[PDB]
Amino acid sequence: ASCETTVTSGDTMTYSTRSISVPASCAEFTVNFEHKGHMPKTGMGHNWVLAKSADVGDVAKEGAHAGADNNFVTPGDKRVIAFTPIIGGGEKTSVKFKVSALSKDEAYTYFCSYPGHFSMMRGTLKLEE
Template identity: 35%
Template sequence: MKNFRINILGVVALGLLSLTSCKDDKKVEGEDTIVVTEDVVTPAEMGTIEVTLNSDDAMKFDTSEIKVKEGQTVILTLNHTGKLPEAAMGHNFVLLKQGVVMADFATAAIAAKDNEYIPNDGKDVIAHTETIGGGESTKITFTAPAKGTYDFLCTFPGHYSMMNGKFIVE
């Protein structure tokens, strides 16, 4: 019975040792205990995510949902895969702050042609690209906001009803 108890204790100890040795955590050793501490990753350490969003002459984005992590650096590339010029079928990407009513913003954007269709000096916007035409691309870099769900849209007149989506920050 004594050998059986020693073997069980050995298996349990070996199992615990393998669990703690597989982790990439910091270990703080005391006399009789080992304390495993988790490394904390701050939002600034989340790295960078690259997102490509394609648009076309049929007034469509190729995705209606973008997911990122809070605090991540987002590099967003907007491609216009169509052929029509900016004056006829311009597209942009606009990420709205929470609580901004998309329809109201898009209506106000119609009068903001000289400001890339961004009304109110951009006070309701987290990030936006310039407006581009067929065959063009543009890129922006910004920091993902606080956790939550945000709206994105194209603010070229008449486009927002078909060209919009959710920007989800986890």
């Protein structure tokens, strides 16, 4: 469908894709996020969080202290452009954001903010005209 992608995860520290392109003719963009694990497992919860590449470390290290009830993202953090809740095996979620929040000229990284995952679990997002 036009302005959307699907990203999956499972019982590993990797997303299904390391690159996402957002068409600049979109007004809104939807990221569908699936966890293909079979059951909820310790240390295997995942989400999808978007920020400028320079902000990743700060957002994740601060977000870790937000707790599981806040989905490991600091409430109301302006560095976070969009995020999904933490999901476990068998679940799915979605986040829709405005394309006007993005800039060509800026560098973006999506990552998982479950404690410790952000180092390996990440990818690049680009606004493509």
